Symmetry: none
Subunit: 218 residues, 2 copies
């Protein structure tokens, strides 16, 4: 297919403000919560590969898409850098890893991973967290939540042992484990191949083992 050019560029897209990301691209994504009220989108890589990404903001959502019929020899060097003052949702349906390396403070965060790649969120501070992992890859979470709903359905692990939550709702239906941390309550259901491990001494627990694996307090 398309031979990536030797001219490595950064394309800056002055997009409208958004609080949600919906991406069907190839390449790693790095999200930063802005501290100066700015919204920005930068795409780094070979100029003829960067040119394949279509960008639009609609209903407070940043949509990143590609012409799926386009053959590319390789997607090496592709880096998508996203920044906005707020973030409430990530819907990922491409190939690559999604990062929040330096924190996110939000009320509600909804993570929907339906692609090939990992999700790694560090220093998260939220009220409600909802994770639906449905693709191939791991979802790594660190920080705090009042409520954390962790639902794994694809192939991979939810690594949320360092995500301190008061109430946890965990269900494992694919292939992989859920590691979590519940200080007050835990509703855990094993329904696939894999186990649910939880830190803490929750007052209320509701456990259901209906697959291949176990529920263990660690």
């Amino acid at each position: 297919g398309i031979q990536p050019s030797k001219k490595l560029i950064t394309r800056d897209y002055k997009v409208k403000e958004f609080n949600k990301i919906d991406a069907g691209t190839v390449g790693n994504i790095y999200y930063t919560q802005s501290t100066d009220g700015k919204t920005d989108l930068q795409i780094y890589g070979p100029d003829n590969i960067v040119a394949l990404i279509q960008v639009a903001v609609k209903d407070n959502t940043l949509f990143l898409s590609i012409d799926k019929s386009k053959k590319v020899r390789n997607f090496k060097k592709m880096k998508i850098t996203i920044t906005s003052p707020t973030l409430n949702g990530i819907s990922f349906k491409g190939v690559g890893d999604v990062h929040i390396e330096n924190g996110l403070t939000t009320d509600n965060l909804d993570i929907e991973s339906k692609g090939v790649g990992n999700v790694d969120i560090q220093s998260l501070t939220c009220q409600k967290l909802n994770v639906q992992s449905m693709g191939v890859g791991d979802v790594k979470l660190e920080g705090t939540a009042q409520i954390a709903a962790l639902h794994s359905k694809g192939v991979g692990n939810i690594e949320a042992g360092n995500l301190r939550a008061n109430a946890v709702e965990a269900s494992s239906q694919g292939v992989g484990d859920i590691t979590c941390n519940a200080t007050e309550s835990i509703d855990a259901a094993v329904r696939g191949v894999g186990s649910i491990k939880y830190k803490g001494s929750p007052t209320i627990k509701s456990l259901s083992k209906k697959g291949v694996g176990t529920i263990k307090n660690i």
Copy 2:
């Protein structure tokens, strides 16, 4: 609901010879190709849970299924051990991993995974291999094949980089990657979210694309 008993048993079923497995059970399966002409089926678990598994051999197929008329509270560890002189097919629609740890020599092998769990086949020697993955899980394959048809439609990877085949037919329509090894020819079609990676220097290649990912020689 049935409470699993504390009496863990192994039940031995002296079944008729079969060359196909069709299982809709909960629990890991371990298949062994016998070298002494024997056919055997053993099921390990709580005795009142083992008693829920329906076993029948019909037209050379071992059928394993759950009597779903009796609700079960919690599942405890289950293990299904299967042995026969030959194996030409595995159809899985339950919950659990399917293993062939110590090899299989066959003419044609047909793998149909519709459930939740992995398929891990080591030291495979066959003429024709057909894999149709439609559930949640990975299909891991090692050994040799003259022809390998690898069709992924669910969520998970086909890990066949150590399966040396002369001709490969690979298509990915779900979420996940196909890693394979084609020495003479490769027909590859990316139609979902994920990539097709192939080892070798095939003489003939046909590469088709309408998805999110790529086709790469590794």
